[PDB]
Enzyme design. Structure first.
Site, mmCIF file in Angstrom:
data_model
loop_
_atom_site.group_PDB
_atom_site.id
_atom_site.type_symbol
_atom_site.label_atom_id
_atom_site.label_comp_id
_atom_site.label_asym_id
_atom_site.label_seq_id
_atom_site.Cartn_x
_atom_site.Cartn_y
_atom_site.Cartn_z
ATOM 1 N N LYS A 7 0.708 -1.161 0.073
ATOM 2 C CA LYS A 7 -0.048 0.076 -0.080
ATOM 3 C C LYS A 7 0.901 1.237 0.031
ATOM 4 O O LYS A 7 0.652 2.148 -0.672
ATOM 5 C CB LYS A 7 -0.670 -0.072 1.165
ATOM 6 C CG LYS A 7 -1.990 -0.859 1.339
ATOM 7 C CD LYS A 7 -3.434 -0.007 1.730
ATOM 8 C CE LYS A 7 -3.241 0.914 2.699
ATOM 9 N NZ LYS A 7 -3.080 2.342 1.881
ATOM 10 N N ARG A 10 2.063 2.090 -3.747
ATOM 11 C CA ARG A 10 1.006 2.440 -4.486
ATOM 12 C C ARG A 10 0.684 3.711 -4.265
ATOM 13 O O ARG A 10 0.537 4.884 -5.004
ATOM 14 C CB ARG A 10 -0.288 1.505 -4.137
ATOM 15 C CG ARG A 10 -1.659 2.244 -4.727
ATOM 16 C CD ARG A 10 -2.774 1.363 -4.727
ATOM 17 N NE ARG A 10 -3.331 1.128 -3.489
ATOM 18 C CZ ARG A 10 -3.985 1.872 -2.592
ATOM 19 N NH1 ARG A 10 -4.372 3.039 -3.087
ATOM 20 N NH2 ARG A 10 -4.263 1.241 -1.586
ATOM 21 N N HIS A 12 2.469 6.291 -2.428
ATOM 22 C CA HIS A 12 3.653 7.082 -2.435
ATOM 23 C C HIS A 12 4.645 7.089 -3.292
ATOM 24 O O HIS A 12 5.589 7.700 -3.346
ATOM 25 C CB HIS A 12 4.038 7.148 -1.062
ATOM 26 C CG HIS A 12 3.254 7.453 0.081
ATOM 27 N ND1 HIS A 12 2.794 8.538 0.302
ATOM 28 C CD2 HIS A 12 2.674 6.623 1.019
ATOM 29 C CE1 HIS A 12 1.765 8.667 1.255
ATOM 30 N NE2 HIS A 12 1.859 7.436 1.723
ATOM 31 N N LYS A 41 -8.404 12.355 -1.064
ATOM 32 C CA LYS A 41 -7.454 12.031 0.023
ATOM 33 C C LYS A 41 -7.310 13.560 -0.028
ATOM 34 O O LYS A 41 -6.789 14.037 -1.083
ATOM 35 C CB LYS A 41 -6.419 11.179 -0.240
ATOM 36 C CG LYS A 41 -5.631 11.004 0.902
ATOM 37 C CD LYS A 41 -4.372 9.954 0.370
ATOM 38 C CE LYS A 41 -3.546 9.551 1.565
ATOM 39 N NZ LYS A 41 -2.417 10.557 2.012
ATOM 40 N N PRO A 42 -7.034 14.377 1.174
ATOM 41 C CA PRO A 42 -6.612 15.659 1.266
ATOM 42 C C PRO A 42 -5.230 15.983 1.056
ATOM 43 O O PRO A 42 -5.086 17.261 0.303
ATOM 44 C CB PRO A 42 -7.274 16.466 2.455
ATOM 45 C CG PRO A 42 -7.150 14.636 3.449
ATOM 46 C CD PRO A 42 -7.513 13.746 2.580
ATOM 47 N N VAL A 43 -4.547 15.441 1.357
ATOM 48 C CA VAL A 43 -2.952 15.513 0.966
ATOM 49 C C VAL A 43 -2.397 14.225 1.000
ATOM 50 O O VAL A 43 -2.632 13.266 1.465
ATOM 51 C CB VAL A 43 -2.345 16.120 2.237
ATOM 52 C CG1 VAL A 43 -0.696 16.496 2.173
ATOM 53 C CG2 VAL A 43 -2.751 17.679 2.707
ATOM 54 N N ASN A 44 -1.328 14.190 -0.094
ATOM 55 C CA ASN A 44 -0.560 13.141 -0.363
ATOM 56 C C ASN A 44 0.825 13.314 -0.872
ATOM 57 O O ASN A 44 0.768 14.267 -2.019
ATOM 58 C CB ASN A 44 -1.342 12.025 -1.095
ATOM 59 C CG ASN A 44 -0.646 10.774 -1.447
ATOM 60 O OD1 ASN A 44 -0.700 9.890 -0.351
ATOM 61 N ND2 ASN A 44 -0.025 10.506 -2.553
ATOM 62 N N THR A 45 1.987 12.766 -0.553
ATOM 63 C CA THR A 45 3.035 12.714 -1.316
ATOM 64 C C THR A 45 3.999 11.670 -1.865
ATOM 65 O O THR A 45 3.398 10.769 -1.579
ATOM 66 C CB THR A 45 4.302 13.278 0.130
ATOM 67 O OG1 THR A 45 3.800 14.391 0.761
ATOM 68 C CG2 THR A 45 5.618 13.692 -0.576
ATOM 69 N N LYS A 66 4.682 12.567 13.777
ATOM 70 C CA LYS A 66 3.861 13.518 14.286
ATOM 71 C C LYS A 66 2.746 13.420 15.064
ATOM 72 O O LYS A 66 2.471 14.391 15.955
ATOM 73 C CB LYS A 66 3.206 14.326 12.961
ATOM 74 C CG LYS A 66 3.940 14.956 11.796
ATOM 75 C CD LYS A 66 2.990 15.377 10.678
ATOM 76 C CE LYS A 66 3.483 16.358 9.720
ATOM 77 N NZ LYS A 66 2.736 16.975 8.723
ATOM 78 N N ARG A 85 -1.800 18.615 -2.592
ATOM 79 C CA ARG A 85 -2.974 19.013 -1.519
ATOM 80 C C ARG A 85 -4.093 19.807 -2.365
ATOM 81 O O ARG A 85 -3.962 20.361 -3.406
ATOM 82 C CB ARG A 85 -2.200 20.102 -0.792
ATOM 83 C CG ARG A 85 -1.741 21.314 -1.308
ATOM 84 C CD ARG A 85 -0.985 22.155 -0.426
ATOM 85 N NE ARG A 85 -1.426 23.244 -0.198
ATOM 86 C CZ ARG A 85 -1.318 23.804 1.225
ATOM 87 N NH1 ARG A 85 -0.507 23.370 2.032
ATOM 88 N NH2 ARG A 85 -1.956 25.036 1.489
ATOM 89 N N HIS A 119 4.125 3.874 6.161
ATOM 90 C CA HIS A 119 3.277 5.085 6.336
ATOM 91 C C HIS A 119 4.342 6.278 5.871
ATOM 92 O O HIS A 119 5.486 6.247 6.397
ATOM 93 C CB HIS A 119 2.803 5.009 7.832
ATOM 94 C CG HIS A 119 2.578 6.469 8.339
ATOM 95 N ND1 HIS A 119 1.581 7.275 7.900
ATOM 96 C CD2 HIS A 119 3.086 7.321 9.200
ATOM 97 C CE1 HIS A 119 1.418 8.428 8.851
ATOM 98 N NE2 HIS A 119 2.596 8.359 9.487
ATOM 99 N N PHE A 120 3.966 7.337 5.251
ATOM 100 C CA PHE A 120 4.777 8.283 5.058
ATOM 101 C C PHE A 120 4.331 9.206 5.887
ATOM 102 O O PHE A 120 2.923 9.614 6.215
ATOM 103 C CB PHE A 120 4.529 9.124 3.551
ATOM 104 C CG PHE A 120 5.593 10.228 3.208
ATOM 105 C CD1 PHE A 120 4.995 11.395 3.495
ATOM 106 C CD2 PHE A 120 6.676 9.987 2.454
ATOM 107 C CE1 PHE A 120 5.872 12.577 3.313
ATOM 108 C CE2 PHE A 120 7.444 10.961 2.301
ATOM 109 C CZ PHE A 120 7.227 12.292 2.676
ATOM 110 N N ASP A 121 5.194 9.832 6.937
ATOM 111 C CA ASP A 121 4.839 10.653 7.895
ATOM 112 C C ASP A 121 5.124 12.482 7.782
ATOM 113 O O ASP A 121 4.337 13.092 8.056
ATOM 114 C CB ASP A 121 5.698 10.433 9.285
ATOM 115 C CG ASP A 121 4.886 10.934 10.579
ATOM 116 O OD1 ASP A 121 3.941 10.620 10.632
ATOM 117 O OD2 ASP A 121 5.551 11.723 11.135
#
Length: 124
Positions: A7, A10, A12, A41-45, A66, A85, A119-121
């Site tokens: 996941k 896919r 990030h 999704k509000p924000v993704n890198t 965070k 974003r 997880h991308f933090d």
């Protein structure tokens, strides 16, 4: 089944381009990666690096996530990333994004055996 590591990939990873090709990159990618399926999704890198180099961050600098969790790691080097974003135009199903190119250190949460990113933090 999609494991947390699959996941992470896919959501990030994007080794296909060295940086966002256009101001429209996020709109295209958020959709193709299925991140606009049931909501926007509000924000993704997205990380434009080899998966091997990103996986190696799990054995670099241990830092706080965070949310206060302690299983986050920071890259020694900077990495090519794209921040996506939502703009005020975004209203599901018409999700709209602002594309922003950056070169920063990344922070990921790692888990498992093998110990890999799940997880991308944040980015610093």
């Amino acid at each position: 089944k999609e494991t947390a590591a699959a996941k992470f990939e896919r959501q990030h990873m994007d080794s296909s381009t060295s940086a966002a090709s256009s101001s429209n990159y996020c709109n295209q990618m958020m959709k193709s990666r299925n991140l606009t399926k049931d909501r926007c999704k509000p924000v993704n890198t997205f990380v434009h690096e080899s998966l091997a180099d990103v996986q190696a961050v799990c054995s670099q600098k241990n830092v706080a996530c965070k949310n206060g969790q302690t299983n986050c790691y920071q890259s020694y080097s900077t990495m090519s990333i794209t921040d996506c974003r939502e703009t005020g135009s975004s209203k599901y199903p018409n999700c709209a994004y602002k594309t922003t190119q950056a070169n920063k250190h990344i922070i990921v949460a790692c888990e498992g055996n093998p110990y890999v990113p799940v997880h991308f933090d944040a980015s610093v």
